[PDB]
Amino acid sequence: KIAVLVVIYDHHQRELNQRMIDIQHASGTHVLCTTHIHMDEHNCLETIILQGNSFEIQRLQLEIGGLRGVKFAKLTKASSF
Amino acid sequence: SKIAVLVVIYDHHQRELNQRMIDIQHASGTHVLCTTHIHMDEHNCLETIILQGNSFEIQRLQLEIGGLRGVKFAKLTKAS
Amino acid sequence: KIAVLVVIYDHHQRELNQRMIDIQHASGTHVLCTTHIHMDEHNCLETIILQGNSFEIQRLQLEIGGLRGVKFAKLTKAS
Amino acid sequence: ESKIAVLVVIYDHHQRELNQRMIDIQHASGTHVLCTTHIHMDEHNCLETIILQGNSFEIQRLQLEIGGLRGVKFAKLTKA
Ligand code: NI
Ligand code: NI
Ligand code: NI
Ligand code: NI
């Protein structure tokens, strides 16, 4: 079910956005959309909203967080009434 | 003055709700940098609210929003 | 097919965001997501991304642009 | 002075170099990108809405540069 992955990454790191986008189109999760803002000169905050099973999400998190330049990849997950 | 995301799911039919949050956030003295809304279905929205301020005002905004009639879910993510 | 509605609205106007949300859930179009930023003290910029047929989109535009406080609602459409 | 605009792009993310090139064009641009939202339409198509801010010439120009790129399928500018 539905979740948000909050990522903070470098900015100065190159081909990182390209590699993140690559991962998401690849992922078995359905990534509804991602928003990015500029945190400061050196840092970027990106909020990914996705749907899927708990393995596919957990995997997509380890994948992104594993990229070099991704400083931080926390995950919020919600299930139901 | 740190940054955090606030993930909320709520029923948009609880009238008063949406505007009340807008009011709580203006009051807050945390600035909402930007926000992304997803209309999940007839009765459920997901907002991700990227915001910035002192860590007490952020702690508080969650405290306030989470308890509102019509808010089903509200988790805060600190950038630290 | 896919499109984006860029809306600039008041901010000081009340129950406007609540009325916008209401419309979209309502719309026959499928609204994928909407992002808002603060433009200044008095103005808000909201970018709605939606999928649907050209009548449903054209309707959703007129509906939103009609609301009081919506200063401006341009539309981008792609085949 | 310094106006605001949204730039809607559709592009193929498999054209490697493309994404990074746009990041570069925008840094150079001397328009500051306030924020941006990306939707993965399918295997080969992304839609970015890029909210940005700067002098109307630099904006004009960013469209002009981005629109022409190998891999960009669509690029329309909306002035505020
Ligand atoms: Ni506000
Ligand atoms: Ni909604
Ligand atoms: Ni940048
Ligand atoms: Ni994409």
Interface membership of C21 toward B (CB under 8 Å): yes
Q: Among A25, C49, A45, A60, which residue's Cα sits nearest to residue D13?
A: A25
Q: Cα separation of C3 and D27, whole Å?
A: 26
Beta pairing, strands D32-42 & D72-79? unpaired
Q: Do D35 and A33 touch (CB under 8 A)?
A: no
Quote the number of domains for chain C: 1
Q: How far is the CA of D34 from the CAs of B57, B76, C26, C35, in angstroms?
A: 24, 23, 30, 12
Torsion over CA: C15, C21, C26, C28 (sign) = positive
Q: Cα separation of D12 and D19, whole Å?
A: 9
Q: Cα separation of C39 and C46, whole Å?
A: 9
CATH number, domain containing residue B1: 3.30.70.1150
Is B34 annotated in some ligand binding site? no
Q: Which residues form the domain of D46?
A: 1-80
Q: Among A63, A68, A79, which residue's Cα sits nearest to residue A28?
A: A63
Q: Cα separation of B9 and B7, whole Å?
A: 7
Q: Do D38 and A34 touch (CB under 8 A)?
A: yes
| SS3 state of residue C9 | strand
| SS3 state of residue B4 | strand
Give the amino acid at D8: V
Give the amino acid at C33: C
Q: What is the resolution of this structure in A?
A: 3.1
Q: Which residues contact B37 (CB under 8 A, 6 or more apart)?
A: B45, B46, B47, C21, C33, C34, C35, C36
Q: In what order do the strands lie in the sheet with D72-79?
A: A70-77, A3-9, A44-51, A30-38, D32-42, D45-54, D3-11, D72-79
Q: Among A32, A12, A4, A9, which residue's Cα sits nearest to residue A20?
A: A9
Phi, psi of A57 (to 5 degrees): -70, -55
Q: Do A35 and D33 touch (CB under 8 A)?
A: no
Q: Cα separation of A10 and C31, whole Å?
A: 31
Q: Please, what is the end-to-end C-alpha distance for chain A in angstroms?
A: 12
CA of D33 to the centre of ligand 3 (A): 7
Q: Which residues of chain A make contact with D32, given a CB cutoff of 8 A?
A: 38
Nearest to D76 among C2, C35, C76 (CB): C76
